[PDB]
């Protein structure tokens, strides 16, 4: 069931849409130079993101998981939103002044949509720049470089790099009085439940959508991979913007190849 590659046709749908949902994934961050540690060429040491972003990995080797997230936090300091992020933010602003809604549902944890100025933003998997205490549950913003002294200079990505093996007491710890708990990234890991309040907001946006754009996602991680297919199955137009086809491509009305930073400025003008 081959989707259309006609931008002119897509633009006629775009012109009429009053409730656009944009779902974004790791490819949009990759176009800003962010290492995603997914796909055929994405590895930190000898692992991919889905090997380390798990409760079991964190239970068995919290130092290694923290090294991985520390590396990613520090690299992000030098990364900026790309033309795709900017086109999405500019579109939201322009349509909002016309009484038309754009909402971004991002799988990404990098805060690049936020940095680009997107306002209607659902970060469905949390953030690299938030911590949660495993003892008291408090969630906090954390941009500190480095997040703790023991991690300074650690997290190097080359294969064969030795574990830092930081004692748990010297990994990031809660600073609330009397707690002292071990912090973790406030990131939804593989095997964990997404936040119910966020899923309810997603459900409402999808149910009312009249055009859905699926941008830079491989459509292999659930639940997010089912969002756009659910809309399409009700007849709602979906346009996939991706450098490759995915398992979901043939469910959608349009497929546009190339970097999202090249195609979205045209599509959303």
């Amino acid at each position: 069931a081959r989707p259309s590659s006609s931008m002119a046709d897509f633009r006629k749908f775009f012109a009429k849409a009053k409730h656009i949902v944009i779902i974004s994934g790791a490819g949009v961050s990759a176009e800003s130079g962010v290492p995603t540690f997914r796909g055929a060429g994405g590895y930190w040491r000898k692992w991919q993101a889905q090997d380390l972003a798990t409760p079991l990995a964190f239970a068995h080797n919290p130092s290694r998981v923290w090294e991985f997230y520390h590396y990613r936090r520090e690299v992000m300091g030098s990364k900026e939103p790309n033309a795709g992020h900017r086109a999405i933010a500019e579109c939201e602003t322009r349509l909002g002044k016309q009484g038309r809604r754009v909402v971004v549902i991002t799988q990404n944890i990098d805060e690049l949509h936020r940095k680009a100025g997107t306002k209607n933003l659902l970060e469905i998997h949390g953030s690299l720049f938030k911590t949660r205490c495993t003892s008291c549950g408090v969630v906090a913003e954390n941009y500190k470089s480095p997040i703790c002294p023991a991690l300074s200079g650690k997290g190097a990505p080359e294969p064969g790099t030795q574990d830092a093996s930081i004692p748990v007491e010297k990994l990031p710890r809660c600073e609330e009085a009397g707690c002292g708990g071990l912090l973790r990234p406030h990131v939804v890991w593989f095997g964990e439940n997404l936040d119910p309040a966020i899923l309810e907001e997603v459900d409402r946006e999808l149910a009312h959508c009249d055009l859905c754009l699926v941008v830079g996602t491989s459509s292999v991680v659930y639940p997010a991979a089912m969002f756009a297919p659910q809309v399409a199955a009700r007849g709602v137009p979906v346009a996939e913007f991706n450098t490759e086809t995915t398992p979901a491509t043939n469910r959608f009305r349009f497929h546009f190849q190339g970097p999202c930073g090249t195609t979205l400025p045209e599509a959303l003008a």
């Binding site: 889905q50 593989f190 991680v221 639940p223």
Partner: peptide, 9 residues
């Protein structure tokens, strides 16, 4: 539709 994050097989 599951609220559990899963790298689909």
């Amino acid at each position: 539709x599951s609220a559990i994050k899963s790298y689909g097989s």
